[PDB]
Swiss-Prot record:
Key word Disulfide bond present: yes
Biological processes, Gene Ontology terms: proteolysis
The protein's name in its UniProt record: Endothiapepsin
Superkingdom of this protein's organism: Eukaryota
Family statement: Belongs to the peptidase A1 family.
Residues of the full protein shown: 90 to 419 of 419
UniProt-listed Enzyme Commission number(s): 3.4.23.22
Disulfide bonds: 255-290
Tagged with keyword Protease: yes
Assigned keywords, A-Z: Aspartyl protease, Disulfide bond, Hydrolase, Protease, Signal, Zymogen
Organism annotation: Cryphonectria parasitica (Chestnut blight fungus)
UniProt-recorded Gene Ontology molecular function terms: aspartic-type endopeptidase activity
Residues covered by the Peptidase A1 domain: 17-328
Catalytic site positions: 35, 199
Lineage: Eukaryota, Fungi, Dikarya, Ascomycota, Pezizomycotina
Amino acid sequence: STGSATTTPIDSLDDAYITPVQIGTPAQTLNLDFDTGSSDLWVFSSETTASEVDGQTIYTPSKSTTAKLLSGATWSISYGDGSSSSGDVYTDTVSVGGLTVTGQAVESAKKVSSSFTEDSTIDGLLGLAFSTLNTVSPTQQKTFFDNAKASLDSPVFTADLGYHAPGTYNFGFIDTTAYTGSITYTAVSTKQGFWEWTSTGYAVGSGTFKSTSIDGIADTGTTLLYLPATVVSAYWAQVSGAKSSSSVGGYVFPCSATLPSFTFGVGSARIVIPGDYIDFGPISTGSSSCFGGIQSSAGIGINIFGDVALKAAFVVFNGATTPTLGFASK
């Protein structure tokens, strides 16, 4: 089997991407944030505290003839941005782009933190990291990809995120028309539960490539590119007037600037992030100070190849017995 679904930016900055997902019988379609940095599929629901719902579409398990309470199971998750959610668990039928999994754990939110409430466009998350990170207790549950894997034509999914435009998540096949050149594959460590890999270096604009190993994660659920302070300083030093602002929370730059590109290495191959992808616009409405799309990871504990980096590539998440990541230009 295969599946193919369009993913759409939630706003004009590409802060996140939503993909329609069918849950239950008859189908209830929710727009979920596919997140290769986490491993829970959770949704706003008829159980979510009413004051914490503000415009989201909710899953109502009582209206699904295939929903079943997973007795005794609870979940609770906290994300790197400080947001969180928790609740109980149903199993139900879940379909993405024509690919159907029966018995998928659908984690129903009883509580969500303010940032979820305040984002009316995201109805939940669909985790695509390794199932060892799933938070369901006392019986850990499998991701949608893990459950579908055996049925797929090939045990892979791909992320093809657009810049200011829709893109595609494919399951079970590699669309050879969706990228240019060849796909370069690189080793993955699953020891932390992430799609963790080592980039071979970087370049700033037209500068020379610096060969240096950068361990980090491919994370579709993180907006920006978080890299070591040395790398980030070298990038922003090429932008007149850019500075790190403790009050804003990272590097800012004059909105009048033209940003240089940023290149990262994948083995001997190179992925070029155009300068425009690094512009996240005014820090506040009407400001001439703009927020940078490349930020320091020094306070995180891990480097994160988020959407800024991934949307410059066609990315293969290869879930074979020994997982690997593939990157191509497009």
